[PDB]
Structures are given as structure tokens and as C-alpha cells.
From a paper:
In the present work, we focus on a class of monocyclic disulfide‐containing 19 amino acid peptides targeting the Vascular Endothelial Growth Factor‐A, the main pro‐angiogenic factor in Human. We proposed to use this peptide as a model to rationalize the thermodynamics of α‐helix stabilization by an i to i+4 lactam bridge. Around 950 Å2 of accessible surface area (ASA) was buried at the peptide‐VEGF interface, that overlapped with the VEGF receptor 1 domain 2 (VEGFR1‐d2)‐binding site. Although only lactam‐bridged ExxxK, DxxxK and KxxxD induced the formation of stable helix in the unbound state, all peptides of the series were helically folded when bound to VEGF.
Constraints caused by the lactam bridges and by the binding of the macro‐cyclized peptide to the VEGF site also made the α‐helices non‐canonical: in each of the four peptides, the residues P8‐11 folded into a 310‐helix characterized by a H‐bond between Glu P8 O and Cys P11 HN. The helix of peptide 4 c (KxxxE) was longer (residues P8 to P14) with a H‐bond network similar to peptide 2 c. In contrast, the helix of peptide 4 c was poorly defined in the electronic density (RSCC=0.76). In the 4 c peptide, the lactam bridge cyclization forced Lys P14 to rotate along phi angle (ϕLys,P14=−47°), which prevented any folding of the P15 residue into the helix. Indeed, crystal structure and NMR data evidenced that the C‐terminus part of the 4 c helix was poorly structured, making it the most dynamic among the bicyclic peptides. Although P10 and P14 residues were in standard rotamer conformation, the constraints due to the lactam bridge destabilized the helix fold and acted as helix breaker at the P15 residue. On the contrary, the monocyclic peptides 1, 2, 3 and 4, and the peptide 4 c had little secondary structure: they displayed a weak maximum at 190 nm, a negative minimum at 204–205 nm followed by a positive slope reaching zero at around 225 nm and forming a small positive peak around 228 nm.
Numbering used by the authors:
A (entry chain V), C (entry chain W): 13 to 107
B (entry chain P): 1 to 14
Write the structure that this text describes.
């Protein structure tokens, strides 16, 4: 009925979380394209720190490669591999 | 394959 | 070592997803105060639709109540119930 404080606190605190990201944000030199899907699920730091003086930042990263459909003018539909950055570890640090 | 509904593979071949 | 197309497409498609939301983002009029945690995990529609002319919107919503701390300088610590909007069902609909 009510989410208890320590549960809310632990679940909200800075950590890698599945985040839906637009592919254009990750591939800015490809904004001429239409992608399918147009967004991908990525592990990315999220949540809050104990202070307005701290920010939640990645401290360990890796890549993941996904099959994405891509089309642009004067091209037909292609499927290709696109790599994305994931966050494996996050920490709270001064801004 | 309605545009408003999640698609199966067949849709992406049309 | 490559995520297959249909798996990325299904995982990215419009659906309720756990989202970490800043309590000020929900309630800008509360920005004078300090909350602990300062963000809460909420189910919110996320992901992408088959066409940038559709948008992922809720078709079922509910309130969730959480135990949150709030305080002001040179003041007692408060703990209390705070309610937030969650999204229970999402669909792709014209913008």
C-alpha cells in the first residue's frame, strides 16, 4: 500500500538502469537516416545521490552491438550492426 | 500490419 | 555477441518501464525544499513507436504512495507519504 522509505531509497540510488535511448543521440553523424527501432535499451547510470552537491556518473563502461534497420534517401532498407556504450558501474561524485 | 501495434517479423518483410 | 533485431525491436517498443524521476521534475513548486531520496522509481511509458508520427502514451494510470523524507534548514526531519503518478499500460497513438 505504501512503499517503505528504505526500499524507495535503495531503489532510487545511483546505479545502472535500463534506459531507452534514441539512436540519433548516440549516432549524431547519422541524423540523415531513419532507424528501426528508433531507440534502443541500454544500461545507463541513473538515479540520485545523497546531495545536491553530487552527481551520478559512470565509472566502468563497455560496448554492446545490436542489429538495427537503417534507411536513407537513395538507399533501400538495410540491416546492420550498430554499437552502443553501456554503463557497468556508477558512483556519486562532486559536480 | 497495423502501424500502431507491436510488429512481428513478417511485418518488416512487407 | 550481437543482439538480434527482433529482440531489440521488442525490448524498445512502447511499454511501461521503470524510470527514475526527480521529485522536482514532478512537482516544480516543491523546488524550495530538500527531499530524501531526491528521486523515485516510477513506471512510466517509454520506448519508441513504429513511426515518428506516433507517440507512446499511457492508457491506464494509477497513483503510488511512497515514504519520503522532507526537510528545511534549521528544522526537524519529516517523513511522510507522498503520491506519484505511474503508467500501467501504454500504446502508440497519433501525436
Amino acid at each position: 500500500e505504501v512503499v517503505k522509505f528504505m526500499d524507495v531509497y535503495q531503489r532510487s540510488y545511483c546505479h545502472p538502469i535500463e534506459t531507452l535511448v534514441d539512436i540519433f543521440q548516440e549516432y549524431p553523424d547519422e541524423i540523415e537516416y531513419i532507424f528501426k527501432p528508433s531507440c534502443v535499451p541500454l544500461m545507463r547510470c541513473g538515479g540520485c545521490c545523497n546531495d545536491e552537491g553530487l552527481e551520478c556518473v559512470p565509472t566502468e563502461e563497455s560496448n554492446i552491438t545490436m542489429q538495427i534497420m537503417r534507411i536513407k534517401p537513395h538507399q533501400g532498407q538495410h540491416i546492420g550492426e550498430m554499437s552502443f556504450l553501456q554503463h557497468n558501474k556508477c558512483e556519486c561524485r562532486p559536480k | 500490419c497495423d502501424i500502431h501495434v507491436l510488429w512481428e517479423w513478417k511485418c518488416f518483410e512487407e
